[PDB]
Amino acid sequence: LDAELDQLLQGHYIKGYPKQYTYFLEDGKVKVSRPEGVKIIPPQSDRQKIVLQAHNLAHTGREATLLKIANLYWWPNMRKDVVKQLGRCQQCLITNASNKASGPILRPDRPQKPFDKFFIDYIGPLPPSQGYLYVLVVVDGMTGFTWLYPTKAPSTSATVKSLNVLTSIAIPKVIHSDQGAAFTSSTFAEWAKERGIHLEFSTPYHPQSSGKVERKNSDIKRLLTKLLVGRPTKWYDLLPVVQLALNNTYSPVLKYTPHQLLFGIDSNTPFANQDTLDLTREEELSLLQEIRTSLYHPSTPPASSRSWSPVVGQLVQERVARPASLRPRWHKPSTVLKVLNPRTVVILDHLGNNRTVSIDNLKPTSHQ
Amino acid sequence: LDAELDQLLQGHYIKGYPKQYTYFLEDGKVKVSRPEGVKIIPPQSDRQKIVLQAHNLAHTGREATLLKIANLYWWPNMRKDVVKQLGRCQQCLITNASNKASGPILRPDRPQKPFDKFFIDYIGPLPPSQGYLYVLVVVDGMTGFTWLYPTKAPSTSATVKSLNVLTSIAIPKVIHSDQGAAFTSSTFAEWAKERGIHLEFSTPYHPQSSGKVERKNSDIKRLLTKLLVGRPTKWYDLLPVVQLALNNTYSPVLKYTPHQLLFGIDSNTPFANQDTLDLTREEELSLLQEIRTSLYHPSTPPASSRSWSPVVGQLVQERVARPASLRPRWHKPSTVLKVLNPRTVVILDHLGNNRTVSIDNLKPTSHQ
Amino acid sequence: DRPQKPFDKFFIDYIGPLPPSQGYLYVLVVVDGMTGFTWLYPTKAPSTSATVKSLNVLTSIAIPKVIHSDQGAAFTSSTFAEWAKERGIHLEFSTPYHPQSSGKVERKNSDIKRLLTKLLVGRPTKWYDLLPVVQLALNNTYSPVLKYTPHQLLFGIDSNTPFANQDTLDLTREEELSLLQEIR
Amino acid sequence: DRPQKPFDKFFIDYIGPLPPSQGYLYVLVVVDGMTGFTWLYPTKAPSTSATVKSLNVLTSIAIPKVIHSDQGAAFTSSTFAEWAKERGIHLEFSTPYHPQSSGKVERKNSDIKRLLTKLLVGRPTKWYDLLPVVQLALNNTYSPVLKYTPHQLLFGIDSNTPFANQDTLDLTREEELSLLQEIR
DNA sequence: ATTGTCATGGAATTTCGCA
DNA sequence: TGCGAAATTCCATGACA
DNA sequence: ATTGTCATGGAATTTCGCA
DNA sequence: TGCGAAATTCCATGACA
Ligand SMILES: O=C1c2ccc(O)c(O)c2C(=O)N1Cc1cccc(Cl)c1F
Ligand SMILES: O=C1c2ccc(O)c(O)c2C(=O)N1Cc1cccc(Cl)c1F
Ligand SMILES: [Mg+2]
Ligand SMILES: [Mg+2]
Ligand SMILES: [Mg+2]
Ligand SMILES: [Mg+2]
Ligand SMILES: [Zn+2]
Ligand SMILES: [Zn+2]
């Protein structure tokens, strides 16, 4: 503070104050003639207060804060002090946006077999058709084969009714869902334990994680819309049609329809493929086993030039889910406990709980 | 049709049916042994019906439709017929998504002078503060200098009250706004003609066009949020503070605050810049004229690898504004009358009106 | 002549009336000829209407080239014919009083009747809820003649619910005793 | 000593009471010393409270180093002093009965009084709505002594509303006749 | 008849202090 | 005429009912 | 304790028919 | 062993409360 600046005025050299400048006194204050002009050099014991008043004018970041300070002051390594303050401003840390993108998305392996993994989800509310407002959508991971059920609500109870009917055909090893009320209930947990079905949940507020079924939702709405053009939106009666229509549609990249991936032979639908007319069912089935293993699988895309990837022990902040008007979009900083994979982490959260969270719902806390 | 295929069966060459294949008859139908298998060659008079039944199963695009047809049929240039049908399917054309991006954005020149152009807009509804729910935001194009007014509604009448107060300072040549109810009313038109102010409107549903003010809205909400952290959202009393705080904040790229761009000298606010303390006001003003003309101006970014740009007379479709559940997201095809600039067009619309529309609210009609 | 495939032929039939369960009285039985895969639908009557409603569910999953049946009223109605023609399904009838399927199918239909009976005793009223578990059972049952279950032939994979206990299917002395008493 | 700048000194004063217009009785007058730029605020009273409310609007646009005033009650109150101290504004008073500004300011204040009078005749009740147009007039008026209008000195540009008719500012024989009659 | 914008904080690049 | 560190500039990211 | 996906239609690239 | 055209494959774009 005053020891340093005293020591300076008498022309002896202090580390950080370049020797080639003349450091006078005037109006009771230490000054210096820098090429930009004459600036006051405050004592070190004053600096934090100054940086703070400058930052507080509009809660500005590094440069915009520095430019205020530089108007009146100079001292060695100003930005280090500015940055020290930014890293401690609660208000800035939880309100500002990130400017680092997520690391590139994972492309999980396709389930190996039909019934290994189901992805389920609700669409709706839709315009009321026959008293029905929602659709339960069930998508077999491996095949894409899809089942549709009209419900009155997206409830556990309507889920259970529908899946009792579906599972008459087969029991899946795993059912993946998002964290909707209907799937996370204890009743639904029981329903699945009762059948040796494992329940797997998306990280919260991250529908991409149910990508398989969400994407099928798009096709379902898109075909429903086309069929309803210029008619009243009476969709209930079309579910069966849409289900069958989609289950028998080719994926151009795969060259197979979901029905074919499931059964290895077309049923009596229009334009049935007849290429295995001469094989025995058994010959057919082992051609299907071959087709199933050799399907195109996409790869992890290039990282963007400014992504971040979570490191164990890093300070990171979870996005507020449904942030009120004029309230911060981020939670207080929290720590990465475990890196589950490069897009998924466990954090020690804003209360004191463990949360498994998508990297897309996180930012790295700025300034460390 | 039958002339062609008859002519063919007897082994004479028809253009389009390669000679090296054997074209027999069987079960009353013309067939051919192609490497993929034996396929029926329908008569030409049957083809449109076939392509149509195949397309109609799930309103599939080119490949997915072709793959159905190829299961049973072969003929010369199948995809040309498939594409002919896709270009005539109303339902597909108005429901499908585009897969061509817009051309790169324009960066309009900065207004030359303060008061040349105002950008105005509403923020809200906000949580009620003193009976107020909205904020009128007025941003001087050239300087960024911003005025804030709390209103009870985003009405013409509250706009006029506020602008009567603002224009006590100066009258702007132009006021740019979006097409909100408050700005498009005949009352507001009169209010502006009365003062020789020209009204300029954004293309509809395209807030980027009010980018100048929208961007300032972000800063306004962001500073309001920080100031309100852990307090009840009593924002009315902060407008003045926020206004002044922002008008005196540096833009790191410019190295000037909006107040400086407007007045060429800081007022008695904290950390006032003092570099022109020794110039006469007149010397100061011509330094300001110099500073104003030399400000950083950004440029049109690279086009994405798959953008389109409108050509006069092209078929294009305007995005439906607020599309009902299960209804098409696109309007019927319409024609580009005039290319106003490469991001703006006049089209002969879905009724019979002329509409000036942003390229971002258009897709090029597929298959021509 | 070409080998037999799944969806080549569905064999359908009604079983009932049964004691009412959740309002239902009958079971429409559909068995795929090639695989022996069974689907079961509860109905309120052996009518064309109930058949159509039920087959509309199934035929939105897969459509048979041929439906085979006895000359039941529901199946010989002209509505049922119109329905089938609409879906390009050929209808096929066994001559009256002489019901013929195929050994595989007959044996399957037998298993169904027996397994039903075994569970509608003790709880003659709770069968509606059990139809799912019955089908899984029937479809994960090993076939003597083929090396495979219907599940396996239909989907070309093992099942997550194998029924490793090829089961009794016969009535214990207790069940013969309270079934020969309840049906009196 | 350093040249004079805008915001160096604001000169403030009350004009009134006037006939009520939209509920208002007075005008707070603020004139920038360097430029002669004028801001006008209608108030209901010459109180510290009305002054503060009005200056809070102005000082959210720009803050003067110094406010100069006569020893009016509103300005010499300790609330008004607390207000100014809070904003780092030095307060400055002319000695009682001896009001001094600067020639530029005095002339400006004169123009304001005269131009007001000229418009509050015929419509002594509609002045509230006219305050905007008065300011534009005053601020786009050519200054004999400087080559420039206040607009130009404040913003360093020409204005989109120049008042090319350096105007009468004097009362026509009709207005002297119905002002020497209405004020009786 | 019109048209994106700019605070942000790591990283990349330049300039500074000294020799 | 060159080094290590500070300062400045660059610029992708994201949010403006 | 978990993780994006895939129809689409121009363009780029390969294959086909013929010589 | 090479050409012009058709066929196939590539892949950016955008939408799944
Ligand atoms: O925002 C939700 C959402 C929220 C909660 C749910 O339970 C749920 O099912 C959904 C849901 O489908 N989306 C749509 C969506 C938006 C953006 C990207 C993707 Cl992949 C996407 F599916
Ligand atoms: O969606 C609107 C909108 C709609 C209608 C209005 O009248 C209006 O003012 C706005 C508005 O501010 N946004 C927010 C917004 C969304 C996406 C991009 C940009 Cl630049 C952006 F400003
Ligand atoms: Mg959901
Ligand atoms: Mg969803
Ligand atoms: Mg708006
Ligand atoms: Mg807006
Ligand atoms: Zn802050
Ligand atoms: Zn279509």
Q: Which residues of C touch A171 (CB under 8 A)?
A: 136, 159-161
C-alpha to C-alpha distance for D163 and B170, rounded to whole angstroms: 12
Q: CA Rg, chain C, in Å?
A: 17
As a dihedral over the C-alpha atoms of residue A78, residue A84, residue A88, residue A89, rounded to 10 degrees, the angle is: 20
Task: List phi, psi (to 5°) of D36.
Answer: 75, 15
Cβ-count burial B294-319 (b if 16+ within 10 Å, e if not): eeeeeeeeeeeeeebbbeeebbbbbb
Give the C-alpha separation, B197 to A190, whole Å.
69
CA distances to A83, A199, B262, D38, D108 from D143, rounded to whole Å, are 49, 83, 21, 13, 10
Q: Is D43 within 8 Å of D26 (Cβ atoms)? A: yes
CB neighbours of residue B190 within 10 Å? 12
Distance from the D177 Cα atom to the nearest Cα atom in chain B, whole angstroms: 31
Q: Which residue of B has its CA nearest to A128?
A: B325
**Which positions ≥6 away from A124 have C-beta within 8 Å?**
A133, A134, A135, A154
Q: Which of C67, C45, C44 shows the shortest CA–CA distance to C55?
A: C67
Which of B168, B169, B122 shows the shortest CA–CA distance to B148? B122
Nearest ligand 2 atom to the CA of B178 is 7
DSSP C68: E
Token readout for B37 is 């298998």
Q: Is the Cβ atom of B214 under 6 angstroms away from ligand 2?
A: yes
Q: How far apart are CA C82 and CA C85, in angstroms?
A: 5
D70 assigned ligand-binding residue: yes
| CA of B211, closest atom in ligand 2 | 20
Consult the annotation and say whether D111 binds a ligand. Answer: no
Which residues contact residue A260 at a Cβ distance below 8 angstroms, ignoring those fewer than 6 apart?
A: A266, A273
Angle between helices B239-247 and B211-228 (to 10 degrees): 120
DSSP string, A143-154: T--EEEEEESSS
β-partners of residue B177 are B120, B201
Pocket test for ligand 2, best of B122, B177, B214 (most atoms within 8 A of CB): B214
Q: How far is the CA of D86 from the C1' of E8 (A)?
A: 31
- With a 6 Å cutoff on the Cβ, whether B180 touches ligand 2 is yes
Q: Which of A94, A331, A50, A83 is nearest to B226 (CA)?
A: A94
Please give the radius of gyration of chain A, using alpha carbons only, rounded to the nearest integer.
Answer: 31
Distance between CA atoms of B318 and B206, rounded to whole angstroms?
12
**For residue B331, what are its two tokens?**
């309007």
Q: Out of 3.90.226.10, 3.40.630.10, 1.25.10.10, 3.30.420.10, which CATH number does the structure's domain C1-184 have?
A: 3.30.420.10
Smallest CA separation from ligand 1 atom 17, residue: A207
Strand B25-26 and strand C66-69: the pairing is unpaired
Nearest Cα residue to A201 out of A29, A357, A7: A357
What are the E-state strand segments in chain C? 10-15, 26-32, 38-43, 66-69, 90-93
| Dihedral-angle region of residue A61 (phi above 0 means left; psi in -120 to 50 means alpha; beta otherwise) | beta
Contact A333, A316 (CB under 8 A): yes
Separation of CA B146 and C1' H14 in angstroms? 36
Paired tokens of D73: 């009650």
Q: Do B243 and D155 touch (CB under 8 A)?
A: no
**Peptide linkage before A18 cis (omega within 30 of 0):** no
From CA A197, how far away is CA A171, in angstroms rounded?
7
- Ligand 2 centroid, distance to A233 Cα (angstroms): 30
Beta carbons of B319 and B331 less than 8 angstroms apart: yes
Helices (H), D1-102: 48-58, 73-76, 78-86
The closest of D52, D46, D62, D51 to D9, measured between CA atoms, is: D62
* CB atoms C157 and A277 under 8 Å: no
Residue contact B284–D62, C-beta within 8 A: no
Strands (E) in A8-115, as ranges, are: 25-26, 29-34, 37-40, 101-102
- Residues 6 or more apart in contact with residue C165 via CB below 8 angstroms: none
Evaluate: CB of A218 within 6 angstroms of ligand 1.
no
Q: Are A71 and B272 in contact (CB under 8 A)?
A: yes
Q: Are A340 and A356 in contact (CB under 8 A)?
A: yes
- Burial zone of A305 (CB within 10 Å; 0-12 exposed, 13-18 middle, 19+ buried): exposed
Q: What is the resolution of this structure in A?
A: 2.7
Atom from ligand 1 closest to the CA of residue A123? 9
Inter-chain CB proximity D132 and B164 less than 8 Å: yes
Which residue from A180, A168, A161 is spatially nearest to A119, judged by alpha carbons? A180
Count CA within 13 A, CB hemisphere, residue C95: 1
Cα A135 to Cα A285: distance, rounded to the nearest angstrom:
33
- D17 CB neighbour count, 10 Å cutoff: 11
Instruction: Please name the helix (run of DSSP H) or strand (run of DSSP E) that holds residue D14, with its range, or none.
Output: strand D10-15
Please, are residues A136 and A120 in contact by the beta-carbon 8 Å criterion? yes
Which residue lies with its CA nearest to atom 21 of ligand 1? A207
Whether B280 and chain D come into contact, CB under 8 Å, resolves to yes
Name the residue at shortest CA distance from atom 14 of ligand 2: B207
| CB proximity list for C130: less than 8 A, separation 6 or greater | C119
Q: How many CA atoms lie within 13 A of C55 on its CB side?
A: 27
Q: How many CB atoms lie within 10 A of CB A336?
A: 19
Measuring from the CA of residue B367 to each C1' atom, give the nucleotide at the shortest distance.
Answer: G9
Could you give the C-alpha distances from A187 to A121, A138, A191, A244, in angstroms and in order? 17, 19, 6, 31
Q: What are A240's two structure tokens?
A: 């069966």
Q: How far apart are CA B7 and CA B5, in angstroms?
A: 5
D88: left (phi over 0), alpha (psi -120 to 50) or beta: left
DSSP D90-149: EEEEPPTT-----HHHHHHHHHHHHHHHHHTTT-TT--GGGHHHHHHHHHTS--SSSSS-
Query: CA-CA distance, A8 to D40, in Å (whole number)?
Result: 52
- Dist CA B269 CA B262 (whole Å): 15
Helix spans in B248-327 (H): 258-263, 281-293
Question: For residue C33, which amino acid is it?
Answer: G
Do the Cβ atoms of A50 and A14 come closer than 8 Å? Answer: no
Rounded distance, CA C138 to CA B309, Å?
62
CA distance linking residue A229 with residue A210, whole number of Å: 29
Is the C-beta atom of A178 inside 6 A of ligand 1?
yes
Task: Return the beta strands (E) in A41-189 as ranges.
Answer: 101-102, 117-123, 134-140, 146-151, 174-177
What residues of chain C lie within 8 A of the CB of A244, using their CB?
59-61, 63
Q: What are the beta bridge partners of residue A241?
A: none
Burial of B193 (0-12, 13-18, 19+ CB in 10 A): exposed
Name the token pair of C9: 């032929």
Q: Please report, for residues B17, B18, B21, B51, the alpha-carbon distance to residue B11 in angstroms, rounded to integers and kept in the order given.
A: 11, 11, 10, 27
* B307 CB closer than 7 A to any strand H atom: yes
Please report the atom of ligand 1 found closest to the CA of residue A179. Answer: 7
CA of B217 to C1' of E13 (A): 33
Residue matched to tokens 């899984």 = C136
Dihedrals φ, ψ of B246, to 5°?
A: -70, -35
| CA torsion through residues A167, A170, A171, A177, sign | negative
Q: Do you find a cis peptide bond into D17, omega within 30 degrees of 0?
A: yes
Provide the sign of the torsion angle of the four alpha carbons B309, B310, B316, B319, taken in this order: positive
- HSE toward the beta carbon, residue A170, CA cutoff 13 A: 25
- In chain A, what are the domains? 5-97 (1.10.340.70), 98-105+304-365 (2.30.30.140), 116-249 (3.30.420.10), 250-295 (6.10.20.110)
C-alpha to C-alpha distance for A63 and A60, rounded to whole angstroms? 8
Rounded Cα distance, C140 and C165, in Å: 10
B93 C-alpha to center of ligand 8: Å?
Answer: 7
Distance from CA of A203 to the nearest CA of C (A): 26
Residue D33 contacts residue D10 (beta carbons within 8 Å): yes
Positions of E strands within A107-250: 117-123, 134-140, 146-151, 174-177, 198-201
User: Straight-line distance from CA A153 to C1' G3, in Å?
Assistant: 29
Q: Which of D1, D6, D9 is nearest to D93 (CA)?
A: D9
CB contact under 8 A, A171 and C153: no
Q: How many angstroms separate the CA atoms of B15 and A361, rounded?
A: 61
Of B350, B268, B362, B310, the closest CA to residue B90 belongs to B350
Q: Which residues of B22-36 are buried (b: 16+ CB within 10 A; e: fewer)?
A: ebeeeeeebbbeeee
Q: Which residue is nearest to nucleotide E6 (CA to C1')?
A: B215
- Gap between the Cα atoms of C133 and C40, Å rounded: 11
Residues C119 and A248: beta-carbon distance below 8 Å? no
- The residue count of chain C comes to 184
User: Per DSSP, what are the bridge partners of residue A30?
Assistant: A25
Q: How far is the CA of B339 from the C1' of E1 (A)?
A: 12
Query: Would you call A268 and C88 a contact, using CB atoms and an 8 Å cutoff?
Result: yes
Contacts of B65 (CB under 8 A, 6+ apart): B51, B54, B55, B82, B85, B86
Asked if the Cβ of residue B76 lies within 7 A of any atom of strand H, the reply is yes
Q: Which DSSP symbol is given to A61? A: -
CB atoms B269 and D63 under 8 Å: yes
Among residues B304, B302, B308, B284, the alpha carbon closest in space to that of B365 is found at B308
Contacts of C6 in chain A (CB under 8 A): 263, 265, 267, 281
User: Do B79 and B62 form a contact (C-beta atoms < 8 A)?
Assistant: yes
Half-sphere exposure of A200 (CA within 13 A, CB side): 14
Task: Please report, in range form, the residues annotated as the binding site of C for Mg(2+).
Answer: 8, 70
Burial C70-108 (b: 16+ CB within 10 A, else e): bebebbebeebeebbeeeebeeeeeeeeeeebbebbeeb
Q: Measured between CB atoms, does A284 come within 8 Å of chain C?
A: yes
Name the 3-class secondary structure at A91. Answer: helix
All structural domains of chain C with their residue ranges: 1-184
CA-based nearest distance B197→chain A, Å: 33
Angle at A345 between CA A343 and CA A351, to 5 degrees: 140
Q: Which two tokens stand for residue A316?
A: 């990171």
- Give the residue among C106, C142, A274 at the shortest CA–CA distance from B40: A274
CA angle, residues A78, A83, A88, in degrees to nearest 5 = 135
Nucleotide nearest to A104 (CA to C1'): G4
Q: Give helix D78-86 / helix D48-58 axis angle, nearest 10°.
A: 20
**CA nearest neighbour of A362 among A320, A325, A322, A326:** A320
Q: Tokens for A205?
A: 């507020």
Amino acid at B16: G
Closest CB from C3, C65, C156 relative to A288: C156
Separation between Cα atoms, residue B59 and residue B89, nearest integer Å: 9
* A121 three-state secondary structure: strand
Look up residue C118 and give its two tokens. 């075994």
Distance between CA atoms of residues A256 and B68, nearest Å: 10
Residue C178 has a CB neighbour count (10 Å cut-off) of 12
Residue A250 CA to ligand 8 centre (angstroms): 15
Furthest-apart CA atoms within chain A: distance in Å: 104
Which of left, alpha, beta for A123 (phi over 0: left; psi -120 to 50: alpha)?
beta
As a whole number of Å, the CA-based R_g of chain D is: 17
- Dist CA B245 CA B241 (whole Å): 6
A186 CB-contact burial (10 Å; exposed 0-12 / middle 13-18 / buried 19+): exposed
Q: Please tell me the distance from the alpha carbon of residue A69 to that of residue D52, in angstroms, as a whole number.
A: 30
**φ, ψ at A298 (rounded to 5°):** -70, 165
Taking the CA of residue A65 and the C1' sugar atom of nucleotide F3, their distance in angstroms comes to 31
Tokens of B270: 């904290």
- Across the interface, whether the CB atoms of A325 and B233 are under 8 A apart is answered yes
For the record, the structure tokens of D111 come out as: 């123009």
Closest alpha carbon to B218 in B273, B152, B275, B144: B144
- Asked if B48 and B79 touch (Cβ cutoff 8 Å), the reply is no
Query: DSSP code of C95?
Result: P
**Hey, which residues does B317 pair with through a beta bridge?**
B363
Residue A34, classed as helix, strand or coil, is strand
**How many other C-beta atoms lie within 10 A of the C-beta of residue D117?**
14
Rounded Cα distance, C127 and C134, in Å: 9
Q: Cα–Cα distance between B220 and B294 in angstroms, integer? A: 27
> Closest nucleotide to residue B92 (Cα to C1')?
G8
Matching residue, tokens 């009870």: B152
* Torsion angle defined by CA atoms of residues B169, B173, B177 and B182, in that order, rounded to the nearest 10 degrees: 60
Q: Which chain B positions have a beta carbon within 8 Å of D62's beta carbon?
A: 259, 263, 267
| Cβ-contact A129, A150 below 8 angstroms | yes
- Tell me how far CA of residue A115 lies from CA of A118, A262, C6, in angstroms: 7, 10, 19
